[PDB]
Design an enzyme around this catalytic site. Structure first.
Site, PDB file in Angstrom:
ATOM      1  N   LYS A  21      -7.692 -11.155 -11.931  1.00 26.19           N
ATOM      2  CA  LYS A  21      -7.640 -12.393 -11.100  1.00 26.19           C
ATOM      3  C   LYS A  21      -8.728 -12.398 -10.023  1.00 26.19           C
ATOM      4  O   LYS A  21      -8.801 -13.390  -9.261  1.00 26.19           O
ATOM      5  CB  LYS A  21      -6.248 -12.601 -10.491  1.00 26.19           C
ATOM      6  CG  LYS A  21      -5.639 -11.465  -9.696  1.00 26.19           C
ATOM      7  CD  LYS A  21      -4.311 -11.866  -9.083  1.00 26.19           C
ATOM      8  CE  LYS A  21      -3.601 -10.738  -8.365  1.00 26.19           C
ATOM      9  NZ  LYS A  21      -2.955  -9.805  -9.319  1.00 26.19           N
ATOM     10  N   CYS A  92      -9.500   9.678 -11.694  1.00 25.94           N
ATOM     11  CA  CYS A  92      -9.503   9.058 -10.347  1.00 25.94           C
ATOM     12  C   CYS A  92     -10.565   9.746  -9.437  1.00 25.94           C
ATOM     13  O   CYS A  92     -11.083   9.145  -8.456  1.00 25.94           O
ATOM     14  CB  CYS A  92      -8.086   9.148  -9.778  1.00 25.94           C
ATOM     15  SG  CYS A  92      -6.767   9.074 -11.039  1.00 25.94           S
ATOM     16  N   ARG A 208      -5.043  -8.054   2.166  1.00 21.18           N
ATOM     17  CA  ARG A 208      -4.013  -9.119   2.331  1.00 21.18           C
ATOM     18  C   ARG A 208      -3.607  -9.156   3.801  1.00 21.18           C
ATOM     19  O   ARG A 208      -2.713  -8.451   4.242  1.00 21.18           O
ATOM     20  CB  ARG A 208      -2.838  -8.830   1.392  1.00 21.18           C
ATOM     21  CG  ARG A 208      -3.063  -9.178  -0.079  1.00 21.18           C
ATOM     22  CD  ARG A 208      -1.753  -8.978  -0.842  1.00 21.18           C
ATOM     23  NE  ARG A 208      -1.795  -9.177  -2.299  1.00 21.18           N
ATOM     24  CZ  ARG A 208      -1.824  -8.220  -3.240  1.00 21.18           C
ATOM     25  NH1 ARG A 208      -1.846  -6.926  -2.927  1.00 21.18           N
ATOM     26  NH2 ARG A 208      -1.852  -8.578  -4.517  1.00 21.18           N
ATOM     27  N   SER A 233      -1.939   1.422  -5.388  1.00 19.12           N
ATOM     28  CA  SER A 233      -3.276   0.783  -5.324  1.00 19.12           C
ATOM     29  C   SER A 233      -3.301  -0.269  -6.426  1.00 19.12           C
ATOM     30  O   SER A 233      -2.627  -0.136  -7.440  1.00 19.12           O
ATOM     31  CB  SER A 233      -4.403   1.780  -5.442  1.00 19.12           C
ATOM     32  OG  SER A 233      -4.350   2.374  -6.717  1.00 19.12           O
ATOM     33  N   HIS A 334      -8.999   0.377  -5.780  1.00 16.17           N
ATOM     34  CA  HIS A 334      -9.085   1.705  -6.433  1.00 16.17           C
ATOM     35  C   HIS A 334      -9.573   1.496  -7.862  1.00 16.17           C
ATOM     36  O   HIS A 334      -8.785   1.601  -8.809  1.00 16.17           O
ATOM     37  CB  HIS A 334      -7.751   2.476  -6.284  1.00 16.17           C
ATOM     38  CG  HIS A 334      -7.723   3.822  -6.943  1.00 16.17           C
ATOM     39  ND1 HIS A 334      -8.891   4.578  -7.147  1.00 16.17           N
ATOM     40  CD2 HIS A 334      -6.698   4.566  -7.409  1.00 16.17           C
ATOM     41  CE1 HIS A 334      -8.566   5.708  -7.736  1.00 16.17           C
ATOM     42  NE2 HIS A 334      -7.218   5.724  -7.915  1.00 16.17           N
ATOM     43  N   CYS A 364      -6.087  12.520  -5.202  1.00 12.95           N
ATOM     44  CA  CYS A 364      -5.352  12.988  -6.372  1.00 12.95           C
ATOM     45  C   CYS A 364      -6.000  12.447  -7.648  1.00 12.95           C
ATOM     46  O   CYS A 364      -6.760  11.435  -7.620  1.00 12.95           O
ATOM     47  CB  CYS A 364      -3.900  12.565  -6.241  1.00 12.95           C
ATOM     48  SG  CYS A 364      -3.703  10.777  -6.197  1.00 12.95           S
TER      49      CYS A 364
END
Lengths: 379, 378
Positions: A21, A92, A208, A233, A334, A364
């Site tokens: 989006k 990650c 936000r 995230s 992220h 992590c």
């Protein structure tokens, strides 16, 4: 006679957008990565022919992220064919391991300047890739290897006692800190604006403002527990890139040095609590730097979930007021491959801006790992 | 006061033809795990001593997906305390895994690593399942996506390597591989693999009595001088090295194969990617303060007889000092695993032959080279 000094002398990134989006859905990850590579060397007024190699972090290096996206992006950015290019997957933490790789090459005397970058289009290559093929023997013998990330987040919330309200307070604080940073112009310098069919994208899309405890308390649980979409995230598109080079190279080319890389680490942990990865990785870099937690001015710890970020901060005995000063991944986003380069670059840039002495970037990693980088101010 | 980084272990599966060889039924994560397990059992080394497993892989997707380094590590029964990371620099992925590991030793970020690679060219096809070429580069710079065979022909044309000269290298590569295999000189590096069909302990790609007369009767593969026989085969295989500080090797009574003295990557024109080894080799020589005159033996990957010959001439190397126990034409070229094999094998050959210095080097799809220069430990 001179100390070996590896420094971060540049930090750039796209704005980060919600996957599916957001503003970056139409940009190929190879094109987005290229945009940031080109943006970094233009911010620095640096000739890319001076670079040894581009090392590109990417959690799912297939489809539009395939064919060695480091080398594709480098070509697409118009960089010379003389550069190396390689793509690194430590999920990650991929682009934080790119920084460690480039730092190692500087010590080996195998080049003086590198780009350590990452990319993820979580819109255009879905988390898990195409053709997910789990090892049948490990599914039966060691099923935690393939546990969902959300279940690891619930495991940490339970085992480290992080209530839904404590997770929601981190979400409120992470958004309020990002808003404060953005509105003071403090995210502008690091951002490379991206041209898209709909127009120029110059600002982060995941923040936000007015995120508040009452609205968060109304959300449905995401994984049959305490964690929600707002304490996780978001699915994110974005790319980040760092210039990793000898101190000598930065001085020679009139580059502003953000920080010195003082120590690096990886540490494995139990996959079922992968979110605790940062604890052992941070202890390693402190031990290697000859420092204690009391020595650290600020920390960038990735907010993959509020449960694990809070559990890590408590276990390390960190003051929450020294964490994620300009917002964290709950607010900023992220994009898996790009986060390590972002939080390392950001920790470096904040250490310089705040006049601090030492910083840590840590996160992590899916599959049970942690990575950390310990940074030192350059006079 | 330098830290010394060494290779103190080298293991590999047997290398087999893709699609028709003995490893077609073995998932690549399972094949990598078998080799990781073999390496540490050969060394009698506790894998809890290892900092990280760095796995080279040209197509890290599907059965090679989900961070195959970490999956292979779990499947081999290694402790969760280890790191795991997958590296893609296509043909050179697992040599860059050695370079990564050597830099982490220097940084004091761990003392012992496995630098490995895997490719099941059977079970993950070249290009991956969702080949998506950058539309702008297809327009601006199509050479980026040039086929390896076309680059091999480009090199044959521009560096003047005749089809016969290429066939002479095919002959010597197979003959050298047969001599090594027949003397039991490939057995020590190999980890036998269990398959549905039984235990695979021997290399599959060697074609004994490969000869000028029979090669000369084959049909061009790329409308030129190159044939199937002067091209490396599609191969299944995995290789792993122990990369560690010299202090760690001595402390654990591990036999050191060689010291890593210098490392390099170098970009080149994708349209002649086969010449990657020239600039990469010149870099490690310059960094080591050495000349080609100083180098006892070279492992140069035989992706194509054309580029291998063209590089060897460009560097002024004696062909008698190249690929002592055979090259990729004969042994195979499972992309992700080749860098670890040729680096490992070059180190093992340096120790076995009593030489001072060796080079492992190779070309990489997309126009790159990688090189490792090795020194004997006194």
């Amino acid at each position: 006679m001179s100390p070996i000094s590896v420094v971060i002398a540049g930090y750039a990134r796209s704005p980060f957008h919600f996957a599916r989006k957001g503003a970056l859905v139409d940009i190929r990850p190879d094109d987005l990565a290229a945009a940031v590579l080109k943006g970094l060397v233009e911010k620095l007024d640096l000739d890319p022919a001076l670079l040894e190699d581009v090392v590109m972090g990417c959690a799912y290096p297939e489809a539009e992220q395939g064919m060695n996206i480091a080398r594709i992006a480098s070509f697409r950015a118009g960089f010379p064919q003389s550069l190396g290019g390689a793509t690194l997957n430590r999920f990650c933490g991929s682009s934080m391991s790119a920084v460690h790789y480039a730092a190692g090459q500087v010590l080996l005397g195998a080049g003086e300047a590198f780009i350590a970058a990452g990319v993820e289009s979580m819109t255009r290559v879905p988390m898990g890739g195409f053709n997910l093929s789990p090892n049948p023997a490990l599914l039966q013998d060691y099923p935690a290897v393939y546990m969902s990330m959300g279940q690891t987040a619930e495991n940490v919330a339970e085992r480290y006692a992080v209530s839904r309200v404590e997770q929601e307070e981190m979400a409120v604080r992470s958004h309020a800190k990002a808003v404060a940073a953005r509105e003071a112009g403090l995210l502008r310098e690091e951002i490379v604006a991206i041209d898209t069919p709909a127009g120029r994208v110059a600002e982060d899309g995941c923040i936000r403002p007015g995120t508040n405890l009452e609205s968060l308390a109304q959300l449905k649980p995401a994984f049959g527990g305490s964690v929600t979409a707002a304490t996780s995230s978001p699915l994110t598109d974005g790319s980040a890139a760092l210039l990793v080079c000898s101190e000598d190279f930065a001085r020679r080319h009139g580059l502003v040095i953000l920080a010195r890389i003082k120590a690096v680490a990886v540490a494995g942990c139990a996959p079922e609590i992968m979110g605790m990865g940062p604890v052992q990785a941070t202890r390693k870099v402190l031990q290697r730097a000859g420092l204690g937690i009391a020595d650290i001015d600020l920390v960038e710890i990735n907010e993959a979930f509020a449960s694990q970020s809070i559990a890590c901060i408590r276990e390390l005995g960190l003051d929450m007021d020294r964490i994620n000063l300009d917002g964290g991944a709950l607010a900023i986003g992220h994009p898996l491959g790009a986060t390590g380069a972002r939080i390392t670059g950001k920790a470096a840039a904040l250490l310089r801006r705040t006049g601090g002495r030492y910083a840590i970037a840590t996160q992590c990693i899916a599959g049970g790992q942690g990575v950390a980088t310990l940074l030192e101010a350059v006079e």
